């Protein structure tokens, strides 16, 4: 249960971070980043609703649940790390864009991370760029 719960704690951090970062004074591009985080949270919520429906169907054990959550769990952990890197110093503006480029470079190791970094960099820089 705790092994599955790591994603739960990461998501509780991510939801609180999205609510906090949703302040307009943090930045319009920062607002776009918060909106992207909220959309990712919504996709994770859709996954969690599917999980509740499967709990209604009784098709898991705690370990199997963690195994199914593993892909989204890694994405949420990466998102929490990126959010910490950004908001710990409130990387906003082009400092946040340089951080986004550096994140895409650090995600070049994992193709999904690099592609998501490029896409989210496009989405965030659309206001700033």
């Amino acid at each position: 249960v705790s092994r599955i719960l790591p994603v739960a704690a990461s998501y509780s951090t991510v939801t609180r971070f999205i609510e906090e970062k949703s302040s307009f004074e943090y930045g319009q591009v920062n607002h776009a980043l918060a909106a992207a985080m909220r959309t990712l949270v919504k996709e994770y919520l859709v996954l969690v609703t599917q999980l509740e429906q499967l709990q209604r169907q009784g098709l898991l054990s705690l370990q199997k649940l963690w195994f199914y959550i593993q892909p989204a769990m890694r994405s949420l952990d990466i998102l929490a790390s990126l959010a910490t890197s950004v908001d710990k110093g409130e990387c906003i503006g082009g400092a946040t864009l340089s951080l986004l480029h550096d994140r895409s470079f650090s995600y070049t190791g994992d193709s999904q991370a690099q592609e998501l970094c490029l896409h989210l960099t496009k989405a965030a820089s659309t206001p700033y760029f």
């Binding site: 199997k64 195994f67 593993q70 070049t108 190791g109």
Partner: protein
């Protein structure tokens, strides 16, 4: 990263196989059903050595550890070249063919 991510996902598939059966199988029958799986684990863990509470072997021989860095990639590639077509030797062969994609990205 690629090697042990492959290990984690392959263990997820192995866990799918393990949990696919009822938990009331004969101990000998289950052991035989994992004998090839047992050989694969022993060969891989002899290169792993993943004891945590009492460190050392995690399966297979007295595996102190696994080789380091991409030198672990070098030793693993040489081993997968020699030890081929077995429980872990074919499993490690498939893992190496997959990490070739990590090698494609490294290119």
């Amino acid at each position: 990263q690629a090697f042990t991510s492959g290990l984690r996902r392959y263990l997820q598939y192995y866990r799918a196989c393990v949990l696919s059966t009822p938990p009331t199988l004969s101990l000998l029958t289950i052991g035989f059903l994992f004998k090839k799986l047992g050989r694969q684990l022993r060969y891989l863990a002899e290169l792993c050595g993943v004891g945590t509470a009492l460190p050392g072997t995690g399966g297979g021989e007295p595996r102190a550890a696994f080789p380091t860095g991409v030198r672990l990639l070098s030793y693993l590639y040489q081993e997968a070249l020699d030890n081929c077509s077995n429980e872990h030797y074919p499993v490690l062969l498939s893992l190496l063919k997959t990490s070739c994609e990590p090698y494609t990205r490294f290119i």
